[PDB]
Design an enzyme around this catalytic site. Structure first.
Site, PDB file in Angstrom:
ATOM      1  N   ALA B  12      -2.700 -16.036 -11.711  1.00 36.65           N
ATOM      2  CA  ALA B  12      -3.150 -14.414 -11.518  1.00 36.65           C
ATOM      3  C   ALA B  12      -1.989 -13.769 -10.786  1.00 36.65           C
ATOM      4  O   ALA B  12      -1.550 -12.582 -11.219  1.00 36.65           O
ATOM      5  CB  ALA B  12      -4.448 -14.564 -10.481  1.00 36.65           C
ATOM      6  N   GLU B 254       1.038   5.723   6.053  1.00 36.58           N
ATOM      7  CA  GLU B 254       0.294   6.721   6.955  1.00 36.58           C
ATOM      8  C   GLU B 254      -1.188   6.524   6.374  1.00 36.58           C
ATOM      9  O   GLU B 254      -2.083   6.750   7.088  1.00 36.58           O
ATOM     10  CB  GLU B 254       0.987   7.940   6.273  1.00 36.58           C
ATOM     11  CG  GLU B 254       2.184   8.388   6.913  1.00 36.58           C
ATOM     12  CD  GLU B 254       2.382   9.981   6.939  1.00 36.58           C
ATOM     13  OE1 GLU B 254       3.458  10.601   6.385  1.00 36.58           O
ATOM     14  OE2 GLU B 254       1.460  10.763   7.294  1.00 36.58           O
TER      15      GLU B 254
END
Ligand SMILES: Nc1nc2c(ncn2[C@@H]2O[C@H](COP(=O)(O)OP(=O)(O)OP(=O)(O)O)[C@@H](O)[C@H]2O)c(=O)[nH]1
Ligand SMILES: Nc1nc2c(ncn2[C@@H]2O[C@H](COP(=O)(O)OP(=O)(O)O)[C@@H](O)[C@H]2O)c(=O)[nH]1
Ligand SMILES: [Mg+2]
Ligand SMILES: [Mg+2]
EC number: 3.6.5.-
Lengths: 422, 440, 69, 5
Positions: B12, B254
């Site tokens: 995956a 942020e």
């Protein structure tokens, strides 16, 4: 990556030979060992079952074994007899008069060291040996007795490798031999301890399919075997072609065996004519199509592997596999969520345009062991025929141990069948 | 500066890695042979795309990545694939025998044989960095490698790199494409082991992605290639702030500040829009106002949770393409009015927004329409805890009967390690409940 | 304030160092506990198969008496 | 609230 094959005894070498006949064709391998196929998907994972000899010759990584040579010369004289590596033929002479003891302790032990030598030759060559698969019967003496010996000998040399077996359960409807209920109970005692996964091939089922369903007036052994080969090609499809689900022996065991002892599978096949997706699905979950004489609706499915082969709609397969689980919700244990898996292989098996192979770990398999135990205890309560075994130096206690141990397995299957959530 | 090393673990992880780096290349105008005609800084560079790509004398732009798998099949396809020239062989690391959907094998038996080699190759990439920012780790919850080896690597990385950020993209298991019955087990184990070693983890629920592919793209039976191509777009949105830069761009770190109120509450919910076919997208253009609305439609969520029944702790909007501040501000004003969106009393309710004017591109032969503007919302909602709950229930049903537990014990694990992992999960669900309660 | 400014930054090192320490230890412990547990499981497996090899001889050495009589 | 020299 690589699997090492071992066929042992009359039954073992017959079904083993047919198995190679069939998959050799699927992979486009002729009796000489050359490739003449169209699709590249054929040679994608050919290394799993074949070695690439000089001159681009594909050779079955298989070992043929017996105590009488009568079955093996038939194989070497058979259609594919030359494809096999002639060194991998390992046959004795003293034979085994359908005596399990002769295969296990006496007559088989002098030959066991010579078979193991051949195993090491093949195993040392493997880039990444995943394990072994064995073909044998449990009613005979060589395949039954010596096969179980071989498993034990191989295990203590390859203890972290997977041990797989296509074991053929004996039925009175196919063999008049009286000591078969003994040979089976003795070998089953070994299988529960020393194999990681065991495909139960039941002769009562193979005969009944042939007579009832296939309307064969008089079924031959080859008729029974045509079912066995179809099954074996079916349950190994995921091993031999580029796929996602159960691509190797270990990943299959991890998905199929919730408890180490309860690793006896109930294989199924469809169509059993010898055709729609909803029809394939219903059939492969039907009692009649089971290769073990058991009604799955008399128990619960612990785990199931379904393999749909041929060109078909994957949405349909998905919708139908969800259909059968929803409608038959009661027959799947609650405490193992998502216990049914589905594989799809583009390449159909020879002849058919699409097939469905079923593999189920059901507590209904206890029906099969109970039949043997009734045949076993009926003879053993009277100490009948025990001279053939004790003569070979065995002990009557080893029968009781084999008896009680086989009875424990049935309880364990009933235990988890009766278990509940919260 | 601020380089980011991607680590792709297991099938995956690798296959999603293919989709991602293919897409990245298309976004930055990088050819499958690594050459980039736009870049005039030969052999070096300080540009925004250099955080994900290193440069060589030949003018070749090389992904700051590593592909690891305990079995060669999947990575072999990379070695021989369309983008084979893009990587250096030492970046593609394969074993021979996989972890057989067994966490124990991935973390111990097989994993230990290769962990040193991987770390050695990760280290060699870190030496190319003027200022490494951290790692991105792509893996499945359900696989033996994706679960077991990932935990091992993350533990080792905490030791060798201290507290440099480690972000996860974790593929949460779905029955429609599950490969193992024991994926609940592997999930709870890797989650427990990695929890204190991961700064932020984006869970991708395959059932959600399966649903979206079926519904919005009318894909009959979605393949991995289908899911990956959608997943890649989402990963691309999240890493866009790291790979591009403009006046309106807000760095991912942020967003990370707002999204994680406590070290353990580091699982943001992703919701992406627009997911639309070329047929539907023709003659129908979606406005900043329209896509922003979709982010609050649970049909577009990446994990199957219900934020309505939960409380919000943060809301970020990662816009890309034709988006102006004016329209965004008005768009959120609407949603502030047309929804209710309850926040916990201890958090403010502002939405932290970022914008990258670089529009979304699409991979050729792709299913997604090429849109002018797109948005990914990252939210910290208590509803994500639903994902743990469904998985914890599946775990509970099997462990009650010790089903399959023997495959784990045989490789060296203990029942204590199971109950311990499960207790951590119980604490996490409890934690996600605690944060939702009102203050006094 | 100067004394405090040092106490803070040294506290951050001490805590980040100790995180590295614990991690390094917790890992080494459970990796060794795993090696022992697996080796033990294999040891007991080999044990059972080797007592079947001596039971097999007690059968070949039980028949060897019966034959000669 | 989006607010650039
Ligand atoms: N979205 C997405 N999920 C995948 C993909 N490949 C595998 N998965 C998921 O991953 C889970 C199984 O883990 P894998 O990554 O295939 O296994 P692995 O990491 O290779 O570990 P082992 O094979 O057991 O050694 C399943 O639940 C799949 O649904 C993929 O390409 N895309
Ligand atoms: N399906 C099938 N079963 C067989 C075949 N040959 C023998 N058996 C079964 O195996 C049992 C006898 O064991 P056998 O293989 O003949 O003893 P061996 O000499 O030790 O291999 C009987 O119950 C038979 O039903 C065969 O070719 N096909
Ligand atoms: Mg794998
Ligand atoms: Mg440059």
């Amino acid at each position: 990556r690589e699997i090492v094959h071992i066929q042992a005894g009359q039954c073992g070498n017959q079904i083993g030979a047919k198995f190679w006949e069939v998959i050799s064709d699927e992979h486009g391998i002729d009796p000489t060992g050359s490739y003449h196929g169209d699709s590249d998907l054929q040679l994608e994972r050919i290394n799993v079952y074949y070695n690439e000899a000089t001159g681009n010759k594909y050779v079955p990584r298989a070992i043929l074994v017996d105590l009488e040579p009568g079955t093996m010369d038939s194989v070497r004289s058979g259609p594919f007899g030359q494809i096999f590596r002639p060194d991998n033929f390992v046959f004795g002479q003293s034979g085994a008069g359908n005596n399990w003891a002769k295969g296990h302790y006496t007559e088989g032990a002098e030959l066991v060291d010579s078979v193991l030598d051949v195993v090491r030759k093949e195993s040392e060559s493997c880039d990444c040996l995943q394990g072994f698969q064995l073909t044998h019967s449990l009613g005979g003496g060589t395949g039954s007795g010596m096969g179980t010996l071989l498993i034990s000998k191989i295990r203590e040399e390859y203890p972290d490798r997977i041990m797989n077996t296509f074991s053929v359960m004996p039925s009175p409807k196919v063999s008049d031999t009286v000591v078969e209920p003994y040979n089976a109970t003795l070998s089953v005692h070994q299988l529960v301890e020393n194999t990681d996964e065991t495909y139960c091939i039941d002769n009562e089922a193979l005969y009944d399919i042939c007579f009832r369903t296939l309307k064969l007036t008089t079924p031959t052994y080859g008729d029974l075997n045509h079912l066995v080969s179809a099954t074996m090609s079916g349950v190994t499809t995921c091993l031999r072609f580029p796929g996602q689900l159960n691509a190797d022996l270990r990943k299959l065991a991890v998905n199929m065996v919730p408890f180490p002892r309860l690793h006896f599978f109930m294989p199924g096949f469809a169509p059993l004519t010898s055709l729609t997706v909803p029809e394939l699905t219903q059939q492969m979950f039907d009692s009649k199509n089971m290769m073990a004489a058991c009604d799955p609706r008399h128990g619960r499915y612990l785990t199931v592997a379904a393999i749909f082969r041929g060109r078909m709609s994957m949405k349909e397969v998905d919708e139908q596999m969800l259909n059968v689980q929803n409608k038959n919700s009661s027959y799947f244990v609650e405490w193992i969520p998502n216990n049914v898996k589905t594989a799809v292989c583009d390449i159909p098996p020879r002849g058919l345009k699409m097939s469905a192979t079923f593999i189920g770990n059901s507590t209904a398999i206890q029906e099969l062991f109970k039949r043997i135990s009734e045949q076993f205890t009926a003879m053993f309560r009277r100490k009948a025929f025990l001279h053939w075994y004790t003569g070979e130096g065995m002990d009557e206690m080893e029968f009781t141990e084999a008896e009680s141990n086989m009875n424990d397995l049935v309880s364990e299957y009933q235990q988890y069948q009766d278990a509940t959530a919260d | 500066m601020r380089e980011c090393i991607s680590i792709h673990v297991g099938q995956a992880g690798v296959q999603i890695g293919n989709a991602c780096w293919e897409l990245y290349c298309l976004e930055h105008g990088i050819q499958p042979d690594g050459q980039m005609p736009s870049d005039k800084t030969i052999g070096g560079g300080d540009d925004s795309f250099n955080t994900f790509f290193s440069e060589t004398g030949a003018g070749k732009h090389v992904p700051r990545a590593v592909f690891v798998d305990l079995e060669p099949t999947v990575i072999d396809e990379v070695r021989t694939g369309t983008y084979r020239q893009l990587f250096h062989p030492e970046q593609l690391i394969t074993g021979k025998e996989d972890a057989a959907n067994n966490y124990a094998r991935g973390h111990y038996t097989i994993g230990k044989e290769i962990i040193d080699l991987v770390l050695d190759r990760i280290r060699k990439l870190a030496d190319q960095c003027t200022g490494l920012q951290g790692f991105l780790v792509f893996h499945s919850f359900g696989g033996g490698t994706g679960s077991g080896f990932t935990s091992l690597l993350m533990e080792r990385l905490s030791v060798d790199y201290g507290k440099k950020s480690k972000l996860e993209f974790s593929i949460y298991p779905a029955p429609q494409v599950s490969t193992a019955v024991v994926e609940p087990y592997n999930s709870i184990l890797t989650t427990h082991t990695t929890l204190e070693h991961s700064d932020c983890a984006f869970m991708v629920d395959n059932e959600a992605i399966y649903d979206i592919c079926r519904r919005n793209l009318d894909i009959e039976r979605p393949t991995y290639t289908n899911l990956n191509r959608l997943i890649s777009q989402i990963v691309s949105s999240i890493t866009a702030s790291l790979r591009f830069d403009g006046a309106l761009n807000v760095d991912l770190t942020e967003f990370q500040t707002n999204l994680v109120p406590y070290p353990r509450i580091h699982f943001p919910l992703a919701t992406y829009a627009p997911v639309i076919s070329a047929e539907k997208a023709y003659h129908e253009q979606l406005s900043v106002a329209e896509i922003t609305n979709a982010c609050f439609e649970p049909a577009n969520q990446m994990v199957k949770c219900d934020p309505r029944h939960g409380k919000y702790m943060a809301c970020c909007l990662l816009y890309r393409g034709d988006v102006v501040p004016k329209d965004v501000n008005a768009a959120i004003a609407t949603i502030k009015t047309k929804r209710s969106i309850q926040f916990v009393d201890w958090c403010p309710t502002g939405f932290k927004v970022g914008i990258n004017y670089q529009p979304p591109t699409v991979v050729p032969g792709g299913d997604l329409a090429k849109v002018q503007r797109a948005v990914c919302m990252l939210s910290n909602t208590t509803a994500i805890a639903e994902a743990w709950a469904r998985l914890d229930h599946k775990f509970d049903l099997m462990y009650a009967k010790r089903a399959f537990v023997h495959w784990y014990v045989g490789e060296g694990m203990e029942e204590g390690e199971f109950s311990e992992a499960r207790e951590d999960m119980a604490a996490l669900e409890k934690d996600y409940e605690e944060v939702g309660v009102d203050s006094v | 304030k100067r004394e405090h400014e040092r106490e803070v930054i040294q506290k951050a090192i001490e805590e980040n160092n100790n995180f590295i320490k614990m991690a390094k230890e917790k890992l080494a412990q459970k990796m060794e506990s795993n090696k022992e547990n697996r080796e033990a499981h294999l040891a007991a497996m080999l044990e059972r198969l080797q007592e079947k090899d001596k039971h097999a001889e007690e059968v070949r050495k039980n028949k060897e008496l019966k034959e000669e009589a | 609230x989006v607010x650039x020299x």
